[PDB]
Design a protein around this ligand. Structure first.
Ligand code: CA
Ligand code: CA
Ligand code: CA
Ligand code: CA
Ligand code: CA
Ligand code: CA
Lengths: 210, 217, 210, 217
C-alpha cells in the first residue's frame, strides 16, 4: 500500500516494515498530526484506507493490548490451539464432564429442582482470566506485544509507530522488522532522525541503505 | 407463633402455619394490603419473642406469574450455596481441585505455546458453577407457580413470612388444600390475604369494625 | 377492538372500559394465564394486537410508572405545557439567560479557557427530578396513575387489569371507568366475580346491567 | 526544589522549573522512561522537604495529541470549582438562589396543572453548570497542544510534576523557548525527558555510566 500527500513527488510505498524519516521538525510535526487526525490532507491507499483500518501508536507503554475485542480474539485463538490436539482436547472434555458430574450431583442434592447447560473450553479460558501481561514490560517487549495483537485485528490494515526508534536498540529494531515480515504485517515507523542503518526513506526525498 | 398487629386491631391476629385472613370490607382489605406494600409503619409483624419481622424477611406476592424464581438475587444465593456444599465434602473438594489444576495446566500450556506473553489468575468453583449455567427449573398454571413460589420461600431461610394477596380467586378448593398441605409438611408460615371467604377451610374473618372471628374450625 | 378464544361463541367487543367476569375459578385462572403469556390461544384484534401493544397489570402498587420511557414522555409533556404560555415561557428564557450569564462570568473568571452551550427548559425539568409520586399511594390512586401514564404510551393499545375490582369501592370503579372514557382509552378488567352493578360480561356468556 | 533519584545515579538530578534531561544512551533513556511509567519502585521523585511525590501527583505525557483536556476527571474538578466560586460570592449565590426558586415554582406550577400526582427534588448549581455544558476550549498543532497541557497542568493543583517524554522531536527551537517561558511565568515544574540534546538550551546530560553534566549554562 501507499502514503501520499501533496508535497511528495511520488507516493511512498508501504511494503512490510517501512521506516520513514522526517528530518525537518516542522514536517515531522505536521505529518504526525495528519496521521493522528486522519479521516484529510494525507492519503493511504488503490482503494483508500479507511480511518478505522489504521492503528496509531504514540504511547507504547500506555497502549491497551488487553481490550475486550483483543481478549476475545486471543481466547478464541487458544481454543483453536486445542483443535489441533484431539487427544488432549478429548481429555479436557473428560475432565470437564467429571467436574460437571460432581456439580450436577450437588444440584440433585440441593433441595431446589435445578437445571444446567454445559461448561465449555472457552468458558474455562475466560474464567482463568487470560490476558497479555504488560505490568513489567520494557518498551521493546511492549512493541512486540502490540505487533502480536495487531495480527489478530483482521480489520486493521496499517499500524503506525510514532517516534519510537528513540527507545529501541539496533538489535531491537532488527527484531521488530523481522517479526513484521514473518507475520506479513504492514507497519510504518515515523521517525524524526535516521534510525541506525536500516533501509529507510528520508524527506529533507531519498532512500538510504537499500 | 407469629403475630400481625396494628392500631385498629382489637387483638393481634396470630399467624401459625398457613393462615387465611378474610378482610370482608373492601376498605379494610385495601387498607391492609396497601399497608403490607408500605411495610417498613402502621402495621406490625413480629415473632413469638416479640422480635419484629423486617421488610427483608417478608416476601410479598400479588403477581404470581411475574414472580421471578431465577432472579439474580436468588441465583447468587444458590451458586454460593452449591459452592458451600463442596466446602463440606473435603474429599469431593479435593477432587475438584485436582481436576481444575489439571485443566489449568493444560490451558496454560497453550498460553506458553502462544506468541504472546500471557498471564492469568485461577478458575474457581463459583466460576465453574456459573459457567455450567445452574438455575431453578421452570410450571404452566398459577396453582403450579404458587407451589414453586412456596418451594423458593422455603429455600430462602432469611425470608420468614410469605404473604399471598388476593390469590384465592385463582385456586380451586383442592388446590388451596394442596397448598396448605405443602405448607404443613414443610413448616412454612404463609398469610393468604383474601377479600372474601375461601371455600370452607378454617380461617379468620375480620369485619368492618376490626372485630375478629374464626370460621370452620 | 376484540377478545376471542375458541370456547367463546362470539368475540367479546372491547370498547372503552370493559368489565369481563369469569365466574369459574378454572377459567379465570386459564384466561389470566393466556393474557400473561400472550404472543397463543387467546386473540385480541381486524389486525391482531401485537404483544408489545398490551400492558398487563396484576400487582398495582408494584407496577413502575416511573420508567425512563414514561418520565421522558412526562417531561416532554411539561415542556409542551409552556408552549401554550408564551408570556411565562419567555420569562423563564429570561431567567435562564440571567443564570447563564452569571455562570458564564464565573467561566471567564476561571483561569481556564472555558466554553459552553445553553441551558434548556427540558434540562431544568430533568434536573428538578420530576416523577410520579407513588410512595403513599392507595390502590385506587395508583390505578389512576397507571391509566394516566398509559395514555402517554401511544404504542400501547390495550391495558388489562387483573383481579383488581376486589380493591376498589363502587365509587372508585365508577371514577376509573369515567376517566377511561374521558381519555379515550381501551381497558379490560378481568374479574373472578361480578363487580358491583356496572355493565359487564359474564362467562359461566351473558351481559348484565346494560 | 524537586529531586529525581534512583539506584544507579551518582547524585540526585534537581528538578527546578523547566528541566531538560538528556539521557544519551538508548538503554538509559528507555530504562528511565519505562521506570516513569512504572512509578509507584526503582526511581524516586521527592520535593525539598524530602516528601515523596506520589503517582497521583505526577502527570506523565508521551501522546500529546491524545491527552484529553476534557476528561471526566477534569470536568468534574472544573464544575466543582465553578460551584465553589459561587459559594464565595454570597451576593451572587443569593441571586442564583432567587432565580432557581422562581424557575422551580414556574415548573412545579405546570406539575400541579398536570393530571399526574408529580413530585420532584431541587435544581442545584452543579446541575445548572453541567446542563450548560461547560468544558475546556479546544489547537491545531502539537506545540499548541503542549501549551494547553501546561495550562491544564497548572490548573490541577494536586499535580505537582509534569513529565514530557520524547517531545523535543516535535518542537522548533522557538517553541521550546515559548514552552519554558510559560513554565517560568507560571512557576511550573516540568521534566522534559529527551534521547539527545535539545538545541542549545541549558540542560543536564546523563551518560552511559549515569554521570551527570550540565550544558549551555
Ligand atoms: Ca455454559
Ligand atoms: Ca509482557
Ligand atoms: Ca478466575
Ligand atoms: Ca445544554
Ligand atoms: Ca401518588
Ligand atoms: Ca436535582
Amino acid at each position: 500500500m501507499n502514503l501520499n500527500f501533496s508535497l511528495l513527488d511520488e507516493p511512498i510505498p508501504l511494503r512490510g516494515g517501512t521506516i520513514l524519516v522526517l528530518e525537518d521538525v516542522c514536517v515531522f510535526s505536521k505529518i504526525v498530526q495528519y496521521c493522528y487526525q486522519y479521516e484529510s490532507e494525507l492519503k493511504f491507499f488503490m482503494k483508500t484506507i479507511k480511518e478505522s483500518e489504521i492503528m496509531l501508536v504514540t504511547d507504547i507503554l500506555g497502549f491497551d493490548v488487553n481490550s475486550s475485542t483483543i481478549l476475545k480474539l486471543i481466547h478464541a485463538d487458544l481454543e483453536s490451539q486445542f483443535n489441533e490436539k484431539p487427544e488432549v482436547k478429548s481429555m479436557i472434555d473428560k475432565l470437564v464432564a467429571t467436574i460437571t458430574e460432581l456439580i450436577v450431583f450437588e444440584c440433585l442434592e440441593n433441595e431446589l429442582d435445578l437445571e444446567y447447560d454445559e461448561i465449555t473450553i472457552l468458558e474455562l479460558i475466560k474464567s482463568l482470566g487470560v490476558k497479555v501481561e504488560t505490568q513489567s514490560d520494557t518498551i521493546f517487549e511492549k512493541c512486540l506485544e502490540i505487533l502480536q495483537i495487531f495480527k489478530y485485528l483482521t480489520k486493521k490494515k496499517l499500524l503506525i509507530f510514532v517516534n519510537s526508534g528513540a527507545f529501541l536498540t539496533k538489535d531491537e529494531v532488527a527484531s521488530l522488522q523481522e517479526y513484521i515480515s514473518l507475520t506479513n504485517l504492514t507497519v510504518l515507523f515515523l521517525e524524526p532522525r535516521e534510525l541506525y542503518d536500516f533501509p529507510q526513506y528520508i524527506l529533507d526525498l531519498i532512500t538510504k541503505n537499500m
